[PDB]
From a paper:
SARSr-CoV spike proteins cover the coronavirus membrane and are exposed to the solvent environment in preparation for contacting a potential host cell, undergoing a suite of conformational changes to bind the viral receptor known as angiotensin converting enzyme 2 (ACE2, in the case of SARS-related coronaviruses) and mediate membrane fusion.
Further, 007 and WIV1 are recognized by antibodies isolated from SARS-CoV-2-infected patients. Previous studies have also demonstrated that the presence of a fatty acid in the FABP is responsible for regulation of the “up” or “down” conformation paradigm of the RBD, whereby presence of the acid ensures the RBD remains in the ‘down’ conformation and loss of the acid appears to permit adoption of the ‘up’ conformation. These structures reveal the presence of linoleic acid in the FABP of all three SARSr-CoV glycoproteins. Remarkably, the maps reveal a conserved network of water molecule coordination of the fatty acid inside the FABP. These waters support the acid within the pocket, in addition to a single putative hydrogen bond formed between the carboxylate head of the linoleic acid and residue R382 of the spike protein, at distances of 2.4 Å (SZ3), 2.7 Å (007) and 3.2 Å (WIV1). Further, N709, N1134, N1074 and N1098 are glycosites on the distal end of S2 near the transmembrane domain of the SARS-CoV-2 spike and are conserved in WIV1 (except for N1074) and SZ3 (except for N1134). Of the civet spikes, SZ3 may be more closely related to SARS-CoV-2 than 007 based on glycosome comparisons. The fact that all trimers were captured in the RBD ‘down’ position further supports the role of linoleic acid in stabilizing this conformation and recommends targeted delivery of linoleic acid as a viable treatment avenue against future zoonotically-derived CoV outbreaks.
Author numbering:
A (entry chain C): 244 to 291
B (entry chain B): 677 to 772
C (entry chain B): 821 to 1012
D (entry chain C): 677 to 1067, 1070 to 1107
E (entry chain A): 532 to 596, 605 to 650, 658 to 676
Write the structure that this text describes.
Amino acid sequence: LKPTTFMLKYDENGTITDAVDCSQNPLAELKCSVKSFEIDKGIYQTSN
Amino acid sequence: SNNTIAIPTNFSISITTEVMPVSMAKTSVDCNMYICGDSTECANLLLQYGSFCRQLNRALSGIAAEQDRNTREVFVQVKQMYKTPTLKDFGGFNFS
Amino acid sequence: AQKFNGLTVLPPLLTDDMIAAYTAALVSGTATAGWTFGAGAALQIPFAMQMAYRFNGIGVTQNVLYENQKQIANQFNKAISQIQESLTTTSTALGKLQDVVNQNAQALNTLVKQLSSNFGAISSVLNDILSRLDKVEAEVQIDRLITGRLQSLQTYVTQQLIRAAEIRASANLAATKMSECVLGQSKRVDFC
Amino acid sequence: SNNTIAIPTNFSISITTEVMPVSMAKTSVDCNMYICGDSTECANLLLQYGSFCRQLNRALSGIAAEQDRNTREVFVQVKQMYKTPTLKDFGGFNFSQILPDPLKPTKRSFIEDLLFNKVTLADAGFMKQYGECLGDINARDLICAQKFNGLTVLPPLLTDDMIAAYTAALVSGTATAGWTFGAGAALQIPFAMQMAYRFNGIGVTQNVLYENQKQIANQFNKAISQIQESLTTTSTALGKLQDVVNQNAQALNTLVKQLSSNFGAISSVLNDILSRLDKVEAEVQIDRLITGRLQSLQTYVTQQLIRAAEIRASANLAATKMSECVLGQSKRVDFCGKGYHLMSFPQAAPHGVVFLHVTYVPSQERNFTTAPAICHEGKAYFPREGVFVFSSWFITQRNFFSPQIITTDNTFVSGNCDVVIGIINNTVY
Amino acid sequence: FQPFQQFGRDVSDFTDSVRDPKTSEILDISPCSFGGVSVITPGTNASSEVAVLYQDVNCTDVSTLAWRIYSTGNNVFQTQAGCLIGAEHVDTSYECDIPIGAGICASYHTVQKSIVAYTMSLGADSSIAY
Ligand SMILES: *[C@@H]1O[C@H](CO)[C@@H](O[C@@H]2O[C@H](CO)[C@@H](O)[C@H](O)[C@H]2NC(C)=O)[C@H](O)[C@H]1NC(C)=O
Ligand SMILES: *[C@@H]1O[C@H](CO)[C@@H](O[C@@H]2O[C@H](CO)[C@@H](O)[C@H](O)[C@H]2NC(C)=O)[C@H](O)[C@H]1NC(C)=O
Ligand SMILES: *[C@@H]1O[C@H](CO)[C@@H](O[C@@H]2O[C@H](CO)[C@@H](O)[C@H](O)[C@H]2NC(C)=O)[C@H](O)[C@H]1NC(C)=O
Ligand SMILES: *[C@@H]1O[C@H](CO)[C@@H](O[C@@H]2O[C@H](CO)[C@@H](O)[C@H](O)[C@H]2NC(C)=O)[C@H](O)[C@H]1NC(C)=O
Ligand SMILES: *[C@@H]1O[C@H](CO)[C@@H](O[C@@H]2O[C@H](CO)[C@@H](O)[C@H](O)[C@H]2NC(C)=O)[C@H](O)[C@H]1NC(C)=O
Ligand SMILES: *[C@@H]1O[C@H](CO)[C@@H](O[C@@H]2O[C@H](CO)[C@@H](O)[C@H](O)[C@H]2NC(C)=O)[C@H](O)[C@H]1NC(C)=O
Ligand SMILES: *[C@@H]1O[C@H](CO)[C@@H](O[C@@H]2O[C@H](CO)[C@@H](O)[C@H](O)[C@H]2NC(C)=O)[C@H](O)[C@H]1NC(C)=O
Ligand SMILES: *[C@@H]1O[C@H](CO)[C@@H](O)[C@H](O)[C@H]1NC(C)=O
Ligand SMILES: *[C@@H]1O[C@H](CO)[C@@H](O)[C@H](O)[C@H]1NC(C)=O
């Protein structure tokens, strides 16, 4: 285990069905920075 | 008066300038960098304020897009890239 | 300093070369076709006849233009030369653009400087706080600092929004002027 | 070149669209609800901040009034509610698609129906009952959350039916009287004569309009059909109105979400604080929470004010366009669409208006040889916004090739044949 | 709820559900205050009587005259803007004096004077012969 920031998804029931690991790669970083699992086509600023 | 008029008999050609701003600098901010630097303790404490930073960056990105929109609206008003003529005389009017 | 504190400036989409190309295209198009382009397909015409039409547009017969063509051309050239000399001489003719630049730079630099405020904490240095205090009290001090710095960023963003609105108004006016003065002959008093 | 000109020999009728925001959502905030919920301790502690909340609500109510002002200024530009004509022919110009149909239940036109279908709104009733919210909890309704946290959206003064009635009145008035109405009392006139006048207004004789009436009407109908088909096809033509809606909704939802911040307190839950702590320390924690939540509300109000200023600028431009393109024929280049403006028609849309601009576009240019002036019996003759053209020499207008024989009627005599540069020798009848 | 969970929370971190410690039944918790209210006044200088508009209340079937209103009265009726209490309905159309919303306007008219509500007029009627 390592200290990290995750984004967890709770579904209609109370069960966690998906997650995003914010440190996996730049796309995951962008997903965590906009707090959404889906991204539209375009160019986005990420962290320095 | 009531019975006389004044009529010009000559004229002059006048050219004047008008300066107009169009666009300003586009900027972006890294909240974590600005507020916490490289401190992991501060970074962890900052997590409960993500909404405010997302709001700030949304505003800034909107401004950034608007700047390019302004420049395009002002300058892109022709469909054909007309070539510069080789002879710049035009009947005595020096365009060079 | 700005970059080390996390503030970035992005490049514009269009470069100066492309903008200059657009302006050159506009000038060439008006000189070769006049006003027909912009209302449809460009229709070329000699410059003397174009100037005669423009004279007709202000209630002056075009025989005047044709009979004083040399004097009119000389006066036009002299006006161009006077503009060139005035621009060459140092002055403050571009103060508006200069102060746009200055305002942006000053805003960013003020943002950098405001990092030195305590906001009521024992110090403005996170390293000092964390070197002296254990987690429990360090948390209180760091919370104060976070609140203050977030407020600083919010103020910057609000002022940026207001400045952007002003700039957008100016840009809309400039686009209207392009359309109505460059692509056609205007009758609005003192507009062009 | 220096001795040749290009003259159009044909033309086409073009219709293009312009989408403009007019108004945004009117909102109001219950400070006590948002900040303290149902907590009497928090409500008592909040009393010393009443000035700030009064200030916030003053700003919001000003915005709310300005929205109705915008809508009125844009759409209420007629004193008489002109009735929709029963016969929608107008000399071959088919207006049905832009005027309401008595048969259909809807009070709008077909294109207006398409426009209203192209924009999706979270809710349209402005009415959400306590029983409805309490009974559909499983849905987790965003509107229910907003309302339970003290944020309200108010209904506009004018209804969609009334706005559509105003647009129908404007279209009927222009179709039956043209431009005379709006400068005084409406004066009816046949549509063909109206179109002839509009043609005359762009430097083209009206004989052209009368001699090509069938072609012009067919082109107008085809342009209307193309607009209708394009609107039927899914696209992003109403993106401005859509993102106005989206911005308002996002602002409110962010306001709801920001309640979860601690702002440095031991917890963000007032009930937890009051269950664990006695009054003295509970007061400190609650003060921190009050400060934070008040700041959030102030930020919302500031951004709302800036958005409202932008919307007001758009509404002022829209009202000017209504006056200058719908109630008259404009000469400002590119103001009422691209080309030589002929006439415009408005259509209502969610939170805005859509202008259909009809303009004249020259096409199919042909070459001719031109001369600045012609010498006859030692006297110089000049044109008067016409051009000399060599097929013999004739005189013609610059926007449509209609060569005419030169005569003293269409020529201006001035001086001799010496000063004029490029003068050619000819005769004048 | 799973066996190890006792409370539930929403996106605002408000506690919105709980398991009863005696029967293990799950209960939703909802706030008590809800709904928008507006006050219509002809001016305190003129009178102290007001009309009250309840947005989010439906009063079409006035048979109980559990409604969420502060007080009933005379001329309680429903309008496109909500439940209106304290104003008399008139079928005539005038220029908008006090805009209530959704095409409804209120005024202060001689019956003695009282608050009245009506549908605003859009303009004078005309007939133009094409
Ligand atoms: C939440 O849990 C419920 C209960 O298990 C799920 O509903 C059942 O789903 C299964 C699998 O699709 C169906 O065969 C059953 O008929 C469903 N029961 C009912 C009463 O509808 C539900 O699918 C779960 N939700 C999600 C998003 O997975
Ligand atoms: C209008 O004024 C101009 C400029 O003064 C006159 O043009 C001058 O004409 C004289 C001969 O008449 C030349 O010697 C000069 O060189 C011309 N220009 C200048 C700047 O001196 C012109 O004659 C006047 N009248 C008209 C009808 O054009
Ligand atoms: C148009 O004006 C330009 C600039 O005044 C003229 O170019 C100058 O011509 C002189 C005389 O030959 C040279 O000494 C300069 O070096 C030129 N300057 C530049 C920047 O090129 C040009 O001749 C004029 N055109 C006409 C047709 O008169
Ligand atoms: C201008 O262009 C129009 C449109 O192209 C021409 O109209 C054509 O008319 C002929 C009969 O004369 C039809 O058979 C064609 O179908 C029409 N073309 C279409 C509909 O595209 C018109 O003849 C041209 N000339 C003038 C003077 O208007
Ligand atoms: C004006 O255009 C409309 C729409 O194209 C025409 O109405 C259509 O008429 C056809 C032929 O009768 C019918 O098949 C369609 O169902 C009609 N559509 C609608 C929406 O009503 C109308 O006939 C045209 N008017 C004239 C005078 O030609
Ligand atoms: C706590 O004790 C109460 C009271 O005895 C229990 O509730 C009753 O349980 C019985 C047996 O199932 C039911 O028949 C009754 O209807 C329940 N209610 C009452 C009011 O008597 C309850 O089950 C106990 N809880 C636990 C977790 O053991
Ligand atoms: C208020 O409730 C009443 C009673 O249910 C509703 O009146 C009925 O509404 C339905 C649905 O539109 C109609 O089909 C009935 O004809 C209505 N009945 C009467 C007697 O009017 C009413 O619509 C509700 N009001 C609102 C604004 O939802
Ligand atoms: C007119 O003549 C020019 C001569 O260069 C030619 O390029 C142009 O295509 C001609 N126009 C038409 C419409 O044929
Ligand atoms: C103020 O008071 C009188 C008496 O009630 C009221 O009728 C009147 O309209 C008011 N005065 C005005 C409006 O000038």
